[PDB]
Amino acid sequence: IDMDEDEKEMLSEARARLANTQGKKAKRKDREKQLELTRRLSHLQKRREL
RNA sequence: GAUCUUCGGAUCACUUUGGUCAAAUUGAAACGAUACAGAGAAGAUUAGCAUGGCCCCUGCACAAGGAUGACACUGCGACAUUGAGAGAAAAC
Numbered sequence A: 001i002d003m004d005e006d007e008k009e010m011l012s013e014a015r016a017r018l019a020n021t022q023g024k025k026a027k028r029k030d031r032e033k034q035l036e037l038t039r040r041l042s043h044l045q046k047r048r049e050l
Numbered sequence B: 001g002a003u004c005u006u007c008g009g010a011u012c013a014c015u016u017u018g019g020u021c022a023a024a025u026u027g028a029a030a031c032g033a034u035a036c037a038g039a040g041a042a043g044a045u046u047a048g049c050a051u052g053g054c055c056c057c058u059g060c061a062c063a064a065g066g067a068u069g070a071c072a073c074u075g076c077g078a079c080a081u082u083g084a085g086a087g088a089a090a091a092c
């Protein structure tokens, strides 16, 4: 019922592993797009408050 | 002017200007730095060769390099609808 605790750790890591997908370094491009969107939103908001 | 000629004249020669543009802030390029992230292949470290072109850089080069040079690598509707029921409406 409580099969110690390290197995919970490995189960959590396995669960994160099985559904991670999306490669490994594809996480850079989407983040860069999000940051560019944030910066352009800030620029536009600054223009409208001006 | 030189030559003859006979003091009438004839010979000899005959139209430049290489202009990225008028004495340098405002018409020959391409950027330093600081501040942000900050190094490809489904755990982790990592060899590379390619594909695409209004992306180039180094090179004498159709060698080869520049992170495998970099960017890109997805995704949807010439679907005909009927198959049926129900409440409505207009209709077997």
Ligand SMILES: [K+]
Pocket: B068
């Ligand atoms: K490499």
Ligand SMILES: [Mg+2]
Pocket: none
């Ligand atoms: Mg190469």
Ligand SMILES: [Mg+2]
Pocket: none
């Ligand atoms: Mg390449």
